Subunit: 357 residues, 3 copies
């Protein structure tokens, strides 16, 4: 033919063979695994045990997936009497006011005192209650702060369980395909001679005893392998004719050119004339290309979709506490009633009165 390349392709046919023994262990066993989350995820600070209980039934589901695998003097007396009458009346009136005012003062100062006493007592109780509310808030705040770190670690260990459950899930299927290879070799090798090369020994198979082994079957295949390979120009196919019309194609062996064309088998360079036994008439060089390919996809780029900051900004609230200092004034500077020592000066007046006595 005249394919994409020239008719000439060069092949190495096998001149001599040597016997080859291959010992192979195809593994067919992976012990099933039970994940006890309270133990694997933690079992340490019991804070983890309680915290995991809130976490959920993750353990049940992960295990489901894995289980799948004279008269004037008298007038002077009257003058004294008039002075006395005025003085006596005045003394009582001033004293009467003194009595009224001091009496009024006593109730008022006492009223002030009770007021001071009551306010202080209530003040003490309110503050203690302020302490009670504030004290509990702090402890409740502390459990909330301490719990979070135990929460971040539990979540961290759980991220490793999901990845390890994935490794155990991928290892289990991988072994399962391996048992189909092992079933296949047992049927197409131990129980029969296998035409396909490379499926039990390099070169063809002349037997294949198998034995069971610790987790999987160990097969001691035995067969011949090629040793020295002769090389000859050969034709992809010989369209015998002057360019394409009707053509001959090698069947069971490449068509080779001696050192003209002569047929040979794949096993041995055994030149034999090209005859209708070795050829199935192929078409007139209808060489049909059929490109086909096999592919897989990779998705874990290191960066990820976006930077953390943009993602955090759409939902994050920077949140600044409106810290406040409760407003207060020390307006009660003093109540220093003073110079009451003038009462001592009034006492000096009493001393003059005592001297008058």
């Amino acid at each position: 033919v005249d394919q994409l390349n020239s008719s000439y392709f060069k092949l190495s046919i096998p001149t001599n063979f040597s016997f080859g023994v291959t010992q192979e262990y195809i593994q067919t066993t992976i012990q099933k695994v039970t994940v006890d989350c309270k133990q694997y995820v933690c079992n340490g600070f019991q804070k983890c045990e309680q915290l995991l209980r809130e976490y959920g039934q993750f353990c049940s589901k992960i295990n489901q997936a894995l289980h799948g695998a004279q008269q004037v003097l008298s007038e002077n007396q009257k003058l004294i009497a008039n002075k006395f009458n005025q003085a006596l009346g005045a003394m009582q009136t001033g004293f009467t006011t003194t009595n009224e005012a001091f009496q009024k003062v006593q109730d008022a100062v006492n009223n002030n005192a009770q007021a001071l006493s009551k306010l202080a007592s209530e003040l003490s109780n309110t503050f203690g209650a302020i302490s009670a509310s504030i004290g509990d808030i702090i402890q409740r705040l502390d459990v909330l702060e301490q719990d979070a770190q135990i929460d971040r670690l539990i979540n961290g260990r759980l991220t490793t369980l999901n990845a390890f459950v994935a490794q155990q899930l991928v290892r289990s299927e991988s072994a399962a395909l391996s048992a189909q290879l092992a079933k296949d070799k047992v049927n197409e090798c131990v129980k029969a001679q296998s035409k396909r090369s490379g499926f039990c020994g390099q070169g063809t198979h002349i037997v294949s005893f198998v034995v069971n082994a610790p987790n999987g079957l160990y097969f001691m295949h035995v067969g011949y392998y090629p040793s020295n390979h002769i090389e000859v120009v050969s034709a992809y196919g010989l369209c015998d004719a002057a360019n394409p019309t009707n053509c001959i194609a090698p069947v069971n062996g490449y068509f080779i050119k001696t050192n003209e064309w002569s047929y040979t088998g794949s096993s041995f360079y055994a030149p034999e004339p090209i005859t209708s036994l070795n050829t199935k008439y192929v078409a007139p060089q209808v060489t049909y290309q059929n490109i086909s390919t096999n592919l897989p996809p990779p998705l874990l780029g290191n960066s990820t979709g976006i930077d953390f900051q943009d993602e955090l900004d759409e939902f994050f609230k920077n949140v600044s506490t409106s810290i406040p200092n409760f407003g207060s004034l020390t307006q009660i500077n003093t109540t220093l009633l003073d110079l009451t020592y003038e009462m001592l000066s009034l006492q000096q007046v009493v001393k003059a009165l005592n001297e008058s006595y």
Copy 2:
């Protein structure tokens, strides 16, 4: 034979073949990947870097899994005033004495009240500032706790995508690894030898197959003949031609066909040849043994999961309502307004009346 269906089965046997070239790339390479968790999970707000540090050694373990891949009387009048004077003078001292004692007593007490107002006020101011100190710190500590949680929810969210992406990189890696066994198999059963099995290197049979190394995997330009026009004939699942199944003949290396009586043929060509002991291995007397066998895989991701979130949340959730309390207080100090002390001015008027009266 008389199998589950009638002896008749219709087979299309090849009449003319045409040459065919397949160019095939079997991929045998996936770069191993290293996950830098501080960078993948963040490297952004450093809040993630500190927060992830508490998160743990998740990075180390995930990497292990991925790395796996009348003168006297006048005197008596004076004596009468003098007796009034004796009583009055004594009375004046006593009233003044009480006045001195009371005002003195009042001064110490009012001053005692003053210290009391002063001390309580000062202590009150200090306690409040401390109330502010404790309350102020609590709020800031509360704020870090609220702000940290959102950064914590996002870190967990990015980590959930890593476990799924480490799983895709783990599944892709084994999938390529089986693919290299196909590539090893084709290299051994195709490039290095002619392969009897059809469909393993070229449609139809194979007459050569040169491999070449390619960017990540081997590229094989296999060449072989493919069937082009297929003739069709009634054929028999194999039968002795005998009336009653005592023993029967089974086609070997080719189907048995009926011409337009029975004649043998190969799989490659409708080359009729008489049925002879060369083409047949004697099969048993119609012991047609059925053997149903099947291959299955399981689907587990139903959209809704085991239970609704609310029931799951209720068994452990506490609705939790803060027992908010307003500290109880009373404004009982309505007033201390001593008033009508103006009567002291009235007393002053009384003093004024007798001042200069003598």
Copy 3:
């Protein structure tokens, strides 16, 4: 040859075959799955709806991975008392004047105390109400933070199961994809042609096969001959010059057997035929080359993990003990019991005695 074991190896060669039918379903379909994370992870208390929004694009990425799949003296007598009276009268006003000044001074001061008590009390009430406002809001904000965390633990709990279920749906999808290659392989090397290899379609060789499309995958009914009673004979791995080996004969297309001397036979039948150049490709002089090779996979999920939780928690954990404090206070406002003002009543008696005396 003289391989690791002795030349002798015992083989069972088929004597009679019986017809065998296998019905096989190779599954080639796994419906693709779309995960609605708001529904799967939550759908419940809308707290899980809003909280998940903080988690971010976990849903988008997981979906990408899954989508990948004497007359004068008398006047003087009274006058001398009157002279004392003149001082006494003036003194009485002077004492009263002090009384007026002091009581006036007291009034302003006691009123100064009154304002002090009133102002402090009012301010005290306002500050406390504000203490209640700040403390009250903190508690409610504390409550949302505690309540949100439990919804956060459960949402993160359900999200952990999604990562494992997305991994099972991802592993099932590739596993089906390899299965379609088996199905493509059987269709090309079985339904479209007779297959030399045993095992690909029917125990024993294959004499025809018909596929038929089935609910999710192809159901192939295959028919072929299968061996029934197998004769056993001593056979030789290979046969040499029956001496120190110079060159040897190796069975080709069939084992070499010893009768009850050596005689060749095919794999299909114990048909003894003399060893001849047709059945032997000359092998080398017992160059028996061993080539040990094996297939292995690795297991990583030991129950324990790298370290106990406590050590891991300790390196980063802060036990954190709240410095709870009780704001310091003193109840020093002892009763200001001004008392014994009853002496004012005693002073009143003094006035009464002289008012009567007048």
